[PDB]
Design a protein around this ligand. Structure first.
Ligand code: HEM
Length: 291
């Protein structure tokens, strides 16, 4: 498969900044969601999940086709809980009906990160909606109960190397796990809706204890009340990952620089961009516009 990027006919940078401004003003408004965590975390989880189905071998899956809108992917067990992110965005799609789904789902992700004080992420437009028969089968998103060998191997299918995997994984400082959605329960840290390098400092500085939970899944619990999944804990079990974890616990700006570069790569995998295409857009924040 080749998927070439097609810009929504007639639209420019100013059209997209209005969709951003709309998502961002609704984030500020619906701040009570999940015990005042807000929707920022579920929206970067939805953008990684629509992108994380990509297969580098045959170019199936990925953000391009906006196929999460279809039943098979929408009802994937690994996507449980993302329906709240979908319903949040649905009014914004009625307001700006010209934007494609893959462009809206991925721009929700970019807007959430910049509005939770994270790095600026360059974004590109052009994903085109594709038919129901292009919806990837379930079972391509990753399990939680596994080790660093499983992680290295899983992320090579999206051709992410070790540094890109540790940088991308830091976006778990955000939000919390929910027993009813995943069989796991608890937050990764204190600042769960501001973007910081806290995931790396917690993994190196806490006294983690392996325990089972009420769903019979294991997880690492610390004294502080935080939790990590087995796959997260793995990053300090592997020596290549552990050095990169140390670097980011000591330099939040190297963390932000590399997260940025990797998160745009994850959102553009599987998409061919012509060079008549617009350069990547750097959207301003509400604060930068005075809104
Ligand atoms: C091997 C990798 C990963 C596994 C096993 C994994 C698994 C999970 C699980 C079990 C949850 C909680 C679901 C719930 O109960 O609601 C979760 C939440 C989340 N994930 Fe991941 N994750 C992985 C990678 C990533 C990556 C790469 C990102 C982002 C770039 C990410 C971002 C998030 C966010 C923001 C949440 C919070 C969701 C919320 O608050 O509702 N995850 N993840």
């Amino acid at each position: 498969l080749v998927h070439v990027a097609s810009v929504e006919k007639g639209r420019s940078y100013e059209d997209f900044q209005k969709v951003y401004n709309a998502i961002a003003l609704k984030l500020r408004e619906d701040d009570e969601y999940d015990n005042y965590i807000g929707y920022g975390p579920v929206l970067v989880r939805l953008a990684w999940h629509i992108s994380g189905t990509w297969d580098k071998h045959d170019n199936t899956g990925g953000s391009y086709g906006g196929t999460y809108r279809f039943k098979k992917e929408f009802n994937d067990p690994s996507n449980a809980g993302l329906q709240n992110g979908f319903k949040f965005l649905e009014p914004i799609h009625k307001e700006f009906p010209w934007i494609s789904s893959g462009d809206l789902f991925s721009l929700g992700g970019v807007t959430a990160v910049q509005e939770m004080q994270g790095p600026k992420i360059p974004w590109r437009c052009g994903r085109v909606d594709t038919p129901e028969d292009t919806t990837p089968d379930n079972g391509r998103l990753p399990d939680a109960d596994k080790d660093a060998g499983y992680v290295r191997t899983f992320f090579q299918r999206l051709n992410m190397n070790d540094r890109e995997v540790v940088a991308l994984m830091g976006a778990g400082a955000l939000g919390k796990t929910h027993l009813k959605n995943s069989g796991y329960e608890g937050p990764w840290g204190a600042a769960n809706n501001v973007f910081t390098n806290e995931f790396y400092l917690n993994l190196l500085n806490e006294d983690w204890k392996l325990e089972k939970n009420d769903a019979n899944n294991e997880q690492w619990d610390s004294k502080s009340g935080y939790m990590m999944l087995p796959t997260d804990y793995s990053l300090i079990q592997d020596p290549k990952y552990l050095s990169i974890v140390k670097e980011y616990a000591n330099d939040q700006d190297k963390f932000f620089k590399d997260f940025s570069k990797a998160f745009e790569k994850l959102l553009e995998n599987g998409i061919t961009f012509p060079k008549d295409a617009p350069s990547p857009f750097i959207f301003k924040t509400l604060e930068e516009q005075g809104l």
